[PDB]
Ligand binder design. Structure first.
Ligand SMILES: [Zn+2]
Ligand SMILES: [Zn+2]
Lengths: 191, 191
């Protein structure tokens, strides 16, 4: 039977999650959770999902950008965002940190806050250490849309949601997403 | 037929509205708009509504708390918020200023962002100058839930929405509204 995605308000989403004990990473209990996450993330079509997003107070994140997800989207868009597909990925106790201060500005969404989008700023290049699905210890280096997902997803693990990181007055309805930015709003894009 | 409430994203909501020319206040054109607002505000049951919330880039706000709106709501709640009914009110080119530093923390919502609530801080006592429905000049002094509505509604006139003023990690689904605050969050209520 499957767990649902929790929405804002639910304390689990706005509280620091506990590090999963390496070694228990291989645990069936945990491997289950990881599978659940992966599934849900794919279920309601998404590219990221943190344990807390399903009631699990653990530091576990799953991510993936399939060329089919990207398939459907403005070529010029996909370009500017620097979005590229990347095989499913799982990280327990990830520890993220920017590889450089270059940043970018685009809209984000979260399955815990649907119907809405907001332009938030993220680091363009980042590096995340931590363990992989098998309790093995990995160092993933990324940039572009993948770096954003990592940041987004890792924040979830600290109780932070994009809404408390968005630029003023860019917040909007999924539907009005393509509407013009209000004057005084930074323009989208990189450096 | 009637105008609909615009949702975030729509530039009108995030841009400073223009002062309505005193004298045109009595204008039928404007008196219409004021009526529309009053209607809509009552239509989808609400207590505040700013011109921009219906595509009108003007500095006009309408508000009203009926003992019937107040009717159904926790007696201890209504109490703590210091909410009291007040006859419909209309203000063009209102100019609001706190009467004192004292503040309070409660959840707010906006018809341009439904399904969501967030705890935002407001001034407990305030004073708003400006004209009334008839182009007549007024000075309204308020406190409690009425002061909040004034602030909320006036912000709309400057392109500011509560989301860019909410306390971090209190944002939530209408449904999860009664859920516990996450740890590290200020407690609701007046000092
Ligand atoms: Zn999310
Ligand atoms: Zn509002």
């Amino acid at each position: 039977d499957l767990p649902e995605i929790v929405a804002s308000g639910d304390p689990v989403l706005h509280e620091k999650a506990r590090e999963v004990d390496p070694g228990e990473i291989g645990s069936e209990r945990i491997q289950k959770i990881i599978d659940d996450m992966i599934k849900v993330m794919r279920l309601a079509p998404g590219v990221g999902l943190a344990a807390p997003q399903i009631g699990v107070p653990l530091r576990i994140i799953v991510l993936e950008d399939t060329k089919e997800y990207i398939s459907y989207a403005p070529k010029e868009e996909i370009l500017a965002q620097e979005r590229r597909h990347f095989d499913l990925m799982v990280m327990v106790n990830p520890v993220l940190k920017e590889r450089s201060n270059k940043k970018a500005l685009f809209f984000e969404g979260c399955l815990s806050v649907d119907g809405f989008r907001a332009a938030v700023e993220r680091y363009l290049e980042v590096v995340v250490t931590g363990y992989d699905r098998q309790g093995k210890r990995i160092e993933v280096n990324a940039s572009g849309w993948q770096a954003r997902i990592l940041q987004h997803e890792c924040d979830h693990l600290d109780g932070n949601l994009y809404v408390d990181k968005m630029v003023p007055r860019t917040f909007r309805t999924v539907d009005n997403l393509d509407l013009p930015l209000a004057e005084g709003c930074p323009k989208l894009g990189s450096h």
